[PDB]
Amino acid sequence: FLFFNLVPDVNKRFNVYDDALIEIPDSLDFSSERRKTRFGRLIDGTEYGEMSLDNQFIGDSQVFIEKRSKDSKFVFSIVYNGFTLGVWVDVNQGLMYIDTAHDPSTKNVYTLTTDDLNENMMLITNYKNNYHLRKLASAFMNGYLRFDNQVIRNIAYELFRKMR
DNA sequence: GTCAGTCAGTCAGTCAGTCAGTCAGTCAGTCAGTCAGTCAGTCAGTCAGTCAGTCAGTCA
């Protein structure tokens, strides 16, 4: 889904395009099979209380992690795994945003993966980015940070994993 | 007894010598914050024993 750049849905029974389909199953059979599990055995009912069964039935959209956006501007700019990435900075309260606002600029742009190199931008090593985006590092280490999109949020997670 | 002095003690004055705070390179120390081979699981492939399928040497 990340590769084809599709935006799924959790309620539209069929997310369709000219070539592909995304199917979330019906609702009545969810209840039918879940009562079936419950009636057959009650620890199957506990499984119905286990969020794993729900994820295998309603799906984990990971929408739980904070998400917002704001018109406030940005300071830095990153490209990771072939995807641009902007770091919006809020005027007040320091609520950092990672929305995809890539303005074509001669501004400094940073990566970590060696596959990303341009005549215009800079590479970063040995934790210089920690000394460049101090506020981003702390803001994620705090509750300040907020991710605009699920793809953005995960991608930022793996970027942090690769950072160290 | 005046004129008022003109070669030693005397005090107004240093004058180079003096102490040691006080920052200060700096010192390797060091200990801790960063980073580079190490191995475990798993992926593809090598051994030499199975299956178990089959043209055929001695006979109907």
Curated annotation (Swiss-Prot):
Taxonomic classification: Viruses, Duplodnaviria, Heunggongvirae, Uroviricota, Caudoviricetes
Family: Belongs to the phi29likevirus gp16 family.
Residues of the full protein shown: 167 to 330 of 332
Effect seen on changing residue 161 to Q: Decreased packaging
Subunit structure: Homopentamer. Interacts with the packaging RNA (pRNA). Part of a DNA-gp3-gp16 complex.
Entry function: ATPase required for the genome encapsidation reaction. Part of the active packaging motor via the binding to the packaging RNA (pRNA), itself fixed to the head-tail connector at the unique portal vertex of the prohead. Binds and supercoils the pre-formed, unit-length DNA bound to gp3 to produce an initiation complex for DNA packaging. Provides the energy to actively pump the viral DNA into the prohead. Approximately one molecule of ATP is used in the packaging of 2 bp of viral DNA.
Region annotation DNA-binding: where it falls in the sequence: 67-164
Source species of the chain: Bacillus phage phi29
Domain commentary: The N-terminus contains the ATPase activity and the C-terminus (CTD) binds DNA. The CTD is likely a vestigial nuclease that has lost its hydrolytic capability since Phi-29 is not a concatamer that neads cleavage.
Entry superkingdom: Viruses
Name of the protein described by the UniProt record: DNA packaging protein
